[model samples]
Target: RKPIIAGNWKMNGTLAEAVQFVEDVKGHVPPADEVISVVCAPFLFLDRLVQAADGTDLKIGAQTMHFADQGAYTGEVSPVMLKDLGVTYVILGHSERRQMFAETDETVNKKVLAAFTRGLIPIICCGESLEEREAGQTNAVVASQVEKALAGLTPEQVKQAVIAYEPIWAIGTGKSSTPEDANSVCGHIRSVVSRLFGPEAAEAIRIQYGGSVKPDNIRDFLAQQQIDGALVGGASLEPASFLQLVEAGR
Candidate 1:
């Protein structure tokens, strides 16, 4: 599988900054076939970012989307809307969303299926908290989250989707899981996929590690057998760092 390095510019950047970011990194990104590069920006600026990234290898993604194509739900952007904007990837069940917006596994499953229906790739997020890790419940928590979030998807869809293992404790804390530990969790996640959707689907699907991922340490994570890419946070905000990350993955 090709390595994917997606920058989750979570709730950062202005409209001008968002557009300028695309311009700054568009020509600098590695070819899509070599390393899949994406920027998951806030919804407010996706249209402008997509337009700015036109004809480039860089792809645009959203932080989240609603399960329904269109609905009465206020303040929710749907999969159809994202697809209309030429957005290709959508992050679902991010820990921030789970904590702040009451996002549940059931809701994440709904959005995952919806994304597939609209021809959008879903980057499903799953991870355990520091307390859970300390209690040795990391595997169980991650396994349960993965199982439920992928509950009804077919093998084909599972193969097309991406799963991100982001330990909540490490996100934006300037702390990171050791490469070995991160890869171990990622490997366990792959095993869960194999158990649920079979080995073929497991091998085909890509797994990303997120949480304070940066250019300096990205090579270490990509060196791991089970780690296919990274769901970058802080380091992705700037063009130089983001380019460094894509190059490191290459």
Candidate 2:
């Protein structure tokens, strides 16, 4: 399968800036087929982004959302609402959300279920903290996160989505996950899927290595067998830098 490179604009980017970034890459993508998919996760301006990116191959995605289909929860977008607004992917279990918003594996699993039920793909995120990596428990931490996110879902449901591994320590700290380090953990997550689901499904599901991914380091990371693409953060906020990442993937 070809790789899927996603530009995660996180909690950053105004609606206007996001549209310009998408517009910037339209006629500039090198080796378009080399990168099978280019997805952009803007904050909550799905309507504006959806219209802006209509003619481009870049698929629309959301930064985060609540697990509930509909409820009294404030500041939360539902899967149904996202589906209606043309969102193809929902990023769940991101390290920042888990750390800043107190999101748990259970919460992520519920949201994953909701995304799939409403015809939205879930880009399930997983990774280790600085302490976990230092303690040499990177594999253990990511393995648990992957299994829990897939909780009761079957192999069929899993093959239809994406999994992004973003280590907490490296994200937004101007630090980057080494290519070797990223491969080891992402490979382990794939193994976890193979063990729980099956070999076929695990291999089919694309895995991303995110965290300070820049044009300079993108090649080494993408060259690995385990890392199908990147979930770019700060580098993706600008059209120029984001285009460089797309070039790296291509």
Candidate 3:
């Protein structure tokens, strides 16, 4: 399994900015094979991104997608559409989506299935709230989120999936989850996969830690045995910092 370092650029960027970033980060990536994979999720920038990344190894992903293939759901993107647009990864169940848009586990499961069916990988985001962590329900909360988000998917689909743990409290909060705490939940996510799928499949699935991921603390988080990669937030905005992240593994 590759250590997938994906940047969820969220709702930002213009086409000019996108092209410039791609041009700036080409070839100098964090050693293609050493890091497993590198992904950039642009806000409504897939078409231009595919062209910009024509033959490059830098993977392109989407911040989110609708569970349904095509429907009356205006402003929603479908997995099929994303596949046709050349997006190889789709981030599902982010804390923002769950809190801001009321995205449910059932919908996330549907989105994951949709992504796999369309030949795109899905990144399952799971984590606990500050209150949940305070009550020592982190593991339980994450386990349920994982189990539910992956419902009805086969062990094979699960293996192809990526899981990102972004504690609700840590996202853009300045305060970070100590590397130990980040590793704990990430390890537990793999453990849930082991219990549901098997040890082999669990090991094959890459688990990334999200929320307040900056270049300075990236190595600390990546040093953990189970912390395969990171899902960056604020630090990924600037091309320089984002490229610095790409150069980390190098």
Q: Which candidate number would show the highest TM-score if scored against the true structure?
A: 1
TM-score of each: 0.99, 0.94, 0.95
lDDT of 1 by residue, 1-250 (tens): 8999999999999999998889989999999889999999999999999999989999999999999989799999999999999999999999999999999999999999899999999999999999999999999999999999999999999999999999999999999999999999999999999999999999999999999898989999999999999999999999899999988778
lDDT (0 to 1) per candidate: 0.95, 0.83, 0.84
Q: Would you list the rank order by TM-score, best first?
A: 1, 3, 2
Instruction: Please write out the lDDT profile of model 3 over residues 1-250, one tens digit for every residue.
Output: 6777888888777888887877777556766677744555665678888778777777788889997889999889888898888888889999999988989998998898888889988888998999999999999999999999888888887888999998989999987899998998899999999999989889888899988989998888888888888888788877778777766644
Question: Which parts of model 3 have CA positions greater than 4 angstroms off?
Answer: none
> If both were scored by TM-score, which would come out higher, candidate 1 or candidate 2?
1
Cα distance off (Å), candidate 3, residue 76:
0.8
Worst 10 residues of 2 by lDDT: 36-45
Runs in model 1 deviating more than 4 A are none
Off by over 4 Å in 2: 30-42
Q: For residue 38, give model 2's deviation from the true position in Å.
A: 4.0
| Best-to-worst lDDT order | 1, 3, 2
Candidate 2 or 1, higher lDDT: 1
